[PDB]
Symmetry: D3
Subunit: 160 residues, 6 copies
Amino acid sequence: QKRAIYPGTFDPITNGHIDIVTRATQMFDHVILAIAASPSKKPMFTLEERVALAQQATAHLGNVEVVGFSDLMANFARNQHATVLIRGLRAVADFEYEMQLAHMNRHLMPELESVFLMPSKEWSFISSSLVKEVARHQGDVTHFLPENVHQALMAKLAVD
Amino acid sequence: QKRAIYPGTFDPITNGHIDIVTRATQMFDHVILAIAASPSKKPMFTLEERVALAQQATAHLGNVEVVGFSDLMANFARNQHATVLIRGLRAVADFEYEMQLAHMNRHLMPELESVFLMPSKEWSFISSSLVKEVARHQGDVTHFLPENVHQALMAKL
Amino acid sequence: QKRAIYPGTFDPITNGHIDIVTRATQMFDHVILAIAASPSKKPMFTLEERVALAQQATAHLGNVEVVGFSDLMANFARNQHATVLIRGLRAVADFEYEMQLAHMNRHLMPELESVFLMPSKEWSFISSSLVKEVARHQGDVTHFLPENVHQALMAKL
Amino acid sequence: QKRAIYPGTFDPITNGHIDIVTRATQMFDHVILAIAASPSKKPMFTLEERVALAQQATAHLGNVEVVGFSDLMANFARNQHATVLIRGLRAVADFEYEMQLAHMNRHLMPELESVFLMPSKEWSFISSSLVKEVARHQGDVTHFLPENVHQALMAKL
Amino acid sequence: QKRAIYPGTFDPITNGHIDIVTRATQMFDHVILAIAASPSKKPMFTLEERVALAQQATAHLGNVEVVGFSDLMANFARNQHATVLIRGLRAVADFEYEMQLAHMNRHLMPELESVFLMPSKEWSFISSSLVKEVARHQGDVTHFLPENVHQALMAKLAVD
Amino acid sequence: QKRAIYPGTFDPITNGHIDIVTRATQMFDHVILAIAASPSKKPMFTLEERVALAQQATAHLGNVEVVGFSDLMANFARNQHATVLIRGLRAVADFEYEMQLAHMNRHLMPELESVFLMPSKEWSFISSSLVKEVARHQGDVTHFLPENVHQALMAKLAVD
């Protein structure tokens, strides 16, 4: 029935993202966790690494499929026949930017309905950018990450 | 069958509410538009009036069921077998209060998942309260309301 | 002659309001400081009192005219031939609500252009409501009010 | 001895308030939990009730003293020899209103320094008002309240 | 009488900016649409292109003059004898940043009064940065742009 | 008794920061004004210059010690035995980012209590980044800076 897309850079996937995609799969029949290449952001992890990490971290969720994309999100969503666009909404969100994006995406593909889900209190306050900054500066971020991502981040920073 | 509940005071239902419930029906098989008695708000219209107005305004949305309730919303949602809780969301929203409400609702019924939908730009600034303030001064609010609601507002005033 | 209207409840007028209306007069030829009766707010001062207080407080601003009104603000503005609607704006403002009000005002009278002005840092945190709360406890609010307004507040309390 | 005051309506005191006052005692030698009569809010509990509830709920915090007051908070703070004013702060807070209040408090007593503390994530969404709304519908709020407060809420309702 | 300045990077001018400058000309006798060079932002369009596009898009507004400037906005406004500073205020605005700028500009030139105007609902939600990002990623942004800017953006992206 | 840390990039220290650290010393027995190296931001002033400027500007405050640090703030605070973390909160603040940082720091070092102080109305509206941008573009920012910082900024921009 409903095909939902949950797009982002997922660099790397965090426990907050796991929370959101878990809620989405309880609500919609099929969820595509869609990872944007985003070369302009100079991601810490390559697209291949991000896809592999997200695949492992969502392996227990049967109706999640992880796939990378390099086009405009709406162009990808259209070709994949998604009709629901999953967004996270939490306490520290840039709320107006999220409203900008939802209006732009409705302009681009009105048949794709933005829906906002809210994570647990535990994951309401921390961005993945702060997680990476803290880890790179020798702070403990294990609490925020799936174990496979924890291992990959330790290795990435060790060789960096 | 995925069952969603769209609760509120709906005093009265506006074109913004119609937009949200319509978006909800495109996503979910059955949508319960659930009107809370809300006596602490001292509503302009009685619950029976609000239910009747919302019934007429949604009569052509076949997957919308309008009901009234006076108990805890989370218990009403469980008793209606709803698992999705529809909330409106827009750029002018006090989204932090919506977060507080969603966390309280989740404490009371964790199986009821809040989902925020965004109305059309046309209804991105309207509210029940602003409509009522303009109508109290005989200002023309027909643009913002279902026709049946406009008539009822004219009679109450 | 460009005619601006600066409407509100002014219950009572404060030094922040004086700052805004003064900035408005530097920009526009004639400024109508328009006091809404606002019965739903149950104001501390009657409309006649609020008009009298604002008249005295603006007596030395030659291009300010203080009036009272009880009808729809947009109709009053049209009837005064105003084409500019002055609103205050500051860092502490609920600017999204100001956007909702401006869009409703534009729906009612599109020819009346909302324009937001920013008060001095000195008045960047004051409000009528906070002044009244402190005064109800005999706190010294003389800094925030025209002298005539301070006296009237002392008598009402 | 650094003396802090933590004032509010505490109608009733919640687990969020307990969290804040506990954090305050880790920082300051003596903390006065000061309950304002607040008649304009028409509180659910009388002042004597609110003081009694907060006394029991803080009985094991040796450096907390619960008092009631009906005068201007800044004068009460001066009369208690407080130099630190504890305010709660969280992601859902209307922080601009907290800024307005802090600037008014500073105008009235510049020696009383506002200090904002952040509660635990567990209490990052609760409020007295939301607890009361759920309790009015017999919803289970025991998670959010000291046991003595839960009992008193059940009796008032 | 009143000389108003409406400054920004205008990279490129959008329908929202057209909306705001149109409202400004209905309110004030003369409006300078002032385009900051802004080399630090690495603008998509050169200053010459931005001025030409803004000139064409405002040609129907008799009391608008487009001019580029490379100095501090307040220094330019002072030398041009502007007394009104036009700012747009919309739903997705970084409101506190706009308050920062208004206070700084009042410090620099107190005789220049900041005034905020609000665009139509249609233009309340989309930044020019998102317009450029979407266009560069193969999305349709024609709705947001004057026709001359649409043509220039297509050509800029085609050769880029 | 209480050791408080007031950390930031202080690039350069401004009157608003002076305000906050003055309030902090009235409240806590010892305050460390701690300057993060922050090479990723490419600071205008070197760490040595920032420390020297902050030292001179706080020389009248007996219980302030200025020290530079290049590690994670929480790791430094822990090794220095700070138990209070001073943050400024003002009208134009990115409030949600400050909440993010406070939650992250509580995760890293729960024994370090974030406290927010509010500056005077005079310093409520202007960021140090805007001060530098305005000065670099030939605007007057003397009002916002201690005299020693004013002199250093004039010299930095003159030779830059």
